[PDB]
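Researcher: Let's walk through a ligand-bound prediction step by step. First, I give you the protein sequence. Second, the SMILES string for chloride ion. Third, you return the three-dimensional complex as structure tokens. Ready?
Model: Ready.
Researcher: Here are steps one and two:
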Amino acid sequence: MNIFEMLRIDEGLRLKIYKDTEGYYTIGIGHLLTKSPSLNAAKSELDKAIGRNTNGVITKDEAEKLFNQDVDAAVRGILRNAKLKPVYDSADAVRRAALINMVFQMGETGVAGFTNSLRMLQQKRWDEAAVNLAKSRWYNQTPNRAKRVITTFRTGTWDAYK
Ligand SMILES: [Cl-]
Ligand SMILES: [Cl-]
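Model: Step three, the predicted complex:
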């Protein structure tokens, strides 16, 4: 199992513009287009990301291509973050994956927010972290996804996703 297959599971794959759990215009494998309410704003951003006149519809390959960039960007965004980086370097491979997932979902910023959870992960206090991670709007809005991610942090294995 790796980050890609993990995020593909959590994010899905949709070839036509859609609105995410949050109501955001999305496409492909969890690619957020805009938080704007405008559909047009959406298709514009899409056209811009793809480099062609889409009419809100993309190919498989195109989704996978936005997918690689966005995983790249999430990683980059961890290794660039004074707060994240230390946690990520402290962790084992599986748990690095779980961190990336969160960062792909919620943004670097979003995650850098979890001060206490982070310190917890850094310390390798798995059970505690998991209960702190759980007291969050993230958990209460996307509980099954969240549970997947927290289990992964707890266990350091891919069970949740098998
Ligand atoms: Cl882009
Ligand atoms: Cl969920």
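Researcher: And what stands out?
Model: The chain is about 65% helix and 10% strand. The first helix runs from residue 3 to 11.
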